[PDB]
Amino acid sequence: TTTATRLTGWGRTAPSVANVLRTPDAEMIVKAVARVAESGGGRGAIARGLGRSYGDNAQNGGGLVIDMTPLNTIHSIDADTKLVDIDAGVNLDQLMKAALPFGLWVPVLPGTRQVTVGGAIACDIHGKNHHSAGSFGNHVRSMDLLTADGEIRHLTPTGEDAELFWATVGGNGLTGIIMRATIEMTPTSTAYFIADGDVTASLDETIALHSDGSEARYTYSSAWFDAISAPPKLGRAAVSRGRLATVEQLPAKLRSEPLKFDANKYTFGPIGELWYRKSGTYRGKVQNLTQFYHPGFLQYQFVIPTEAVDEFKKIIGVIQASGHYSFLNVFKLFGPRNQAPLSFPIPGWNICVDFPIKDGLGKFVSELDRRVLEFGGRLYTAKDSRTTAETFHAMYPRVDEWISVRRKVDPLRVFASDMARRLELL
Ligand SMILES: Cc1cc2nc3c(=O)[nH]c(=O)nc-3n(C[C@H](O)[C@H](O)[C@H](O)COP(=O)(O)OP(=O)(O)OC[C@H]3O[C@@H](n4cnc5c(N)ncnc54)[C@H](O)[C@@H]3O)c2cc1C
Ligand SMILES: CCOC(=O)NC(=O)c1ccsc1NC(=O)c1nc2ccccc2s1
Fold first, then answer.
1. DSSP code at position 33
2. What is the DSSP letter of 246?
3. Which residues pair with 46 in a beta bridge?
4. CA dist 320 to 59, 146, 207, 226, 235, Å?
5. If we measure between CA atoms, which residue out of 332, 359, 360 comes closest to residue 347?
6. What is d(CA 394, CA 378) in angstroms, rounded to the nearest whole number?
7. Gap between the Cα atoms of 193 and 220, Å rounded
């Protein structure tokens, strides 16, 4: 049956040991849960996907961890209803490849494609197109949730059981095990993007670019930005914005199969600024997914409400001056949020930094937490392993609402993880 394994997140940190069940037989999974639900509850069970979450949500020290990747059956795809019916274990690379021939696009892609559907729902993932498409949960039309009582619940966003549906979205696996879901895809005539590229010189410029209205012309938008340069070079960004291309906008070479998928001395001087500027400035460039989107450390991500822009600028300044240097930095403006209590995204300034692990970093991020909290923002659980129950419960004021739903569906704490215990969501 199970195999005791040392599990971490993608951050390869905070390791715990659990029994890792790995079966393609869904019957076995159901019985593994009934087994846990009878043995008092103990340290319970958590589902695990491709383990791309940095946090400790896909691990359950001294408990059961169910690997879902074996359950990777695509059941159906329909180009007319735009619906795909797949097992939770299918990953989004797999799904993308299978659905392109139907002229269907995965409605929310994150930075890797190596994430399962279960993981995408459970962390309610977002991406480059959040401001136009929302997050993953917005596109789930149904799901089948294995609950603590051994029953499989068919959930929909509306009608009854909506509450448990929207508690499961962003619920980090703590409502039970998603076995199978139905996703509504985005119609597309190509696998290509038409991309505009802009380059800013200061943070104030970046922000201006994201509030001038131009953002409404693009469905996909994000930026790499400078978190190391002192002001006013601090916060300058390479912005990449675009939308899916039509067949008529493809060069003839590509129009045949439109849905096919397959530092020198100058560098820090004035000539290179011109290089990086000219090279990062373009209009109507045709790019495929890889070019446009998918080309020891502590990953840290937060969002600040749109209005609190001055506070957002202050936090960036804090980061630069902190002596903690991040090169890989992702800036994006989120759009409207959804009804999931524990959903990460809210409208406003979202940023992702990557800190090398060194002295006083742990203490510094704790400071950052307080500022993010102070300013009405929050951290993302799929990126976080160190924050306290305190900060988290204050960042997510509907956590109480969420918990009540969770206790309604799992009274005996049959489902559990490291994160649940740390953030007191158990
Ligand atoms: C390089 C990189 C880039 C990334 N970019 C983005 C991004 O742009 N946007 C974004 O939002 N995220 C991003 N992420 C994070 C990633 O999308 C999420 O952490 C996602 O949840 C990972 O999916 P997974 O299958 O690996 O889940 P895991 O890491 O295995 O598990 C994550 C959570 O999902 C739950 N879960 C998994 N399967 C099930 C199931 N079948 N039933 C119930 N619960 C389940 C687990 O219990 C756990 O709570 C990135 C991660 C990496 C490594
Ligand atoms: C890899 C480039 O990806 C993107 O352009 N990023 C996005 O558009 C985007 C939008 C909102 S959040 C986000 N990206 C993220 O949260 C990412 N985290 C990591 C960690 C390691 C490597 C790549 C990434 S991308």
1. H
2. P
3. 65
4. 33, 46, 17, 9, 9
5. 332
6. 9
7. 9
d(CA 64, CA 45) in angstroms, rounded, equals: 4
- Number of domains the chain is built from: 1
Q: How many angstroms is the resolution? A: 2.6
CA of 128 to the centre of ligand 1 (A): 16
Cβ neighbours of residue 241 closer than 8 Å, sequence gap 6 or more: 195, 196, 197, 198, 214, 215, 217, 218, 220, 221, 222
Ligand 1: atom nearest CA of 71 is: 41
Q: Looking at the CA of 193, which ligand is closest? A: 2
Which amino acid belongs to residue 285?
K
Protein residue with least CA distance to atom 23, ligand 2: 111
Q: How far apart are CA 276 and CA 283, in angstroms?
A: 15
> Which of 23, 91, 116, 343 should be mutated for ligand 1, with most atoms under 8 A from CB?
116
Which amino acid makes up residue 230? A
Host H or E run for residue 402? helix 399-409
Distance CA(250)–CA(51), nearest Å, equals: 37
| Number of residues assigned to the chain | 426
Q: Are 22 and 3 in contact (CB under 8 A)?
A: yes
Residue 224: CB atoms within 10 A of its CB come to: 16
Q: Which of 345, 353, 395, 398 is nearest to 370 (CA)?
A: 395
Collapsing DSSP to helix, strand or coil, 210 comes out as: coil
Q: Which domain holds residue 252?
A: 1-426
Where are any strands of DSSP class E within 339-389? 348-356, 378-379
DSSP labels, 247-303: GGGS-HHHHSSTT-----TTTTSHHHHHHHHHHT-EEEEEEEHHHHT---EEEEEEE
Q: From the CA of 129, which ligand is nearest?
A: 2
Pairwise CA distance, residues 288 & 105, whole Å: 13
According to the 3-state scheme, what is the secondary structure of 53-67? CCCCCCCCCCCEEEE
**Of all atoms in ligand 2, which is nearest to the CA of residue 240?**
5
